[model samples]
Target chain A: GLVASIYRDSKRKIIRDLQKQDIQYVEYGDTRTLIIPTDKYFMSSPRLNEICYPGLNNVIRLLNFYPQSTIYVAGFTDNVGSRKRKLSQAQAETMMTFLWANGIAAKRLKAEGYGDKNAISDNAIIHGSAQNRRIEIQWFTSEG
Target chain B: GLVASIYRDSKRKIIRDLQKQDIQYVEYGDTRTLIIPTDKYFMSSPRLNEICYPGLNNVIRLLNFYPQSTIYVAGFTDNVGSRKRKLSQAQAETMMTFLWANGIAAKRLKAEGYGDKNAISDNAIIHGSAQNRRIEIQWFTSEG
Candidate 1:
């Protein structure tokens, strides 16, 4: 089928191994940041128009599947935009909209904006700031 | 050819973008909260029956190549048996192990446990809980 949707969810073999570790259970709250890497975007040119089009909810499928895991959406921005705040917020909103439409509960998620405030690399040669322009899903956890 | 490969650091375009935005550096430490969504893995019996089976690194590659997003690693239990916990953590460890081996750094990652408490379905249900019994790799992002 669709190449086993790699969305992380507990499965049999995985669970069995945890039992041996004797981990107890506890509620870590929804604040736990669930990181969803925003790579592999589907961008195709629209018919006759120079506009880029998004593919089916492939990335959405990745985020929407995790209902139980609280998602903390973050965005990264490159230095190309004139207004840093504007670009960062825009990217964050875009990621939020996509995931919400896909199936994740808006309530279980929170979106934060970080315009390339932190560059993973030095612009002198690397593009780490643009890499910072990413959305992350996160959450807290305790040994269970 | 695979649309992406998990082990190729050079393929990480975001890193390059970060470099471009480095003119104005922001104080963003290595963010380690986002988890990656992993696809359901089906280890066909024929493949499993073999002893010199592929190493767990391939599994991590599956998650990385599928999305090419670096995620925080964590293991979750399915509440099945003692044996399950070990297996799950082993995968989680190996996944991180590979990430570090690939140069992602160690401190930026954390592996935790979420026992059966967070399962999507109870013991009776079948086919739906795949989301509940596996490891998660989270990536972080802010609202664009």
Candidate 2:
């Protein structure tokens, strides 16, 4: 009833990670279950201490992680203020330059600002607002 | 009827990765179908082996294969015990790390750790437990 990538490795070790929740690992990935942490994972902008934030230093470190990879940047927003159009453009610009100044090659990256058009959550709900505010990145190689 | 949004980038490009599921692609804007999964997705505190739990790093890795994604994490507790609490938290953390270390970054993800919040499933455990113990992830990006 759940969707997951079910597979096994060379040793025939069966592996399946079901969707959702934040649980710490116990018993080495077996006999352990955790509640997912949606708050942080779905957030659009990384806070000061957050991993992907621009000035937190993690972004600087991440810039060096992928030099030749073609990164695709797109912006999204939640339905809240009347500045939906403004927020959409802002998020797109923010995320693109944020990744670029950090060190990702400009030629290796593509940027697009998408206003509040596509969303994973319902705009009518508070929770959906959080889900809607996000920017996505994709690293593509020549093979991709 | 399901909720929907029009992606800003290129109306012609927003694509759905979960092609097998009931989803629709349109020429006007990107649409998100509300084909909510079964009770199997809202786990309340299932045993470790339940698919909802995030013990297997590889499975989480597979989910990250998609670049920009939104995921939900919830917990189910028939009754919270010390072991369950610790185990569940541990389970969720494992997943968080899996996505973060692999380049999805902390912001590209969202997770929730609910012990026993909503119960759209039956009161009986087991299959009900299977139904209640889970998380959800939905993601979309514009096409070129």
Q: Number of the top candidate by TM-score?
A: 1
lDDT tens readout by residue for model 1, B27-117: 1243222222223332211112122223232333333433434455655433446544544554455445445544454566556554534
Candidate 1 C-alpha lDDT tens digits along A1-144: 233433234332233332232211112443332222233331101110112322223333333344566565554444346544433444454444445434557687665535323222333422232244334444443423
Question: Which parts of model 1 have CA positions greater than 4 angstroms off?
Answer: A1-66, A81-83, A113-133, A142-144, B1-144
| lDDT digits (tens) for residues B82-140 of candidate 2 | 44443233324333333443345568755454453422234342232334333323344
Question: What TM-score does prediction 2 earn?
Answer: 0.26
First chain TM-score for all predictions: 0.45, 0.43
Error of 1 at A98 (Å): 1.2
Give DockQ for candidates 1 onward, in order: 0.01, 0.01
Which candidate achieves the best lDDT against the true structure? 1
Candidate 2 regions exceeding 4 Å error are A1-66, A81-83, A113-129, A142-144, B1-144
